[PDB]
Amino acid sequence: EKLGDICFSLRYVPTAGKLTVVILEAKNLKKMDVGGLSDPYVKIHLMQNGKRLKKKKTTIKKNTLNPYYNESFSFEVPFEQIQKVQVVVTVLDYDKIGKNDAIGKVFVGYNSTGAELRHWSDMLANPRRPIAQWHTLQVEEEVDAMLAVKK
Numbered sequence: 001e002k003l004g005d006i007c008f009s010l011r012y013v014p015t016a017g018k019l020t021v022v023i024l025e026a027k028n029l030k031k032m033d034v035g036g037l038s039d040p041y042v043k044i045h046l047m048q049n050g051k052r053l054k055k056k057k058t059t060i061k062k063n064t065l066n067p068y069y070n071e072s073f074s075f076e077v078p079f080e081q082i083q084k085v086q087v088v089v090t091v092l093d094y095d096k097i098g099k100n101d102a103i104g105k106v107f108v109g110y111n112s113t114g115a116e117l118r119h120w121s122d123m124l125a126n127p128r129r130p131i132a133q134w135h136t137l138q139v140e141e142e143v144d145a146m147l148a149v150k151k
């Protein structure tokens, strides 16, 4: 089964050590609600080797598998640290308070691979320019495992 796709932009300003992630939209999200659709929001976790650092989240959209956000989030990551971090993006279905029901997950950073690594590398090769890219969502537990694999 397909979990969905997410589009976000990445921008790095090396002088200021400012990392900006804009959650743009998601599409083809898995239906999570019985009979219904999903109520998606997106968490953005800045991590280091799968260890928590800073956490942010989007607003919640109701009853949609194709949410449009255009919500920006910024993180302070000094130049010397930018190849040590992981930007972890999780789409969840809001259902009840305090309960996390993940639809799918992906991360970018130096220890990511494939199209995730490409997005990260394109960001670094284009300082100060926001680079937008689509990503296929994966199962949370599979992404969590990969966060622990260092290059």
Ligand code: NA
Binding pocket: 112, 113, 114, 115, 116, 117
């Ligand atoms: Na990957």
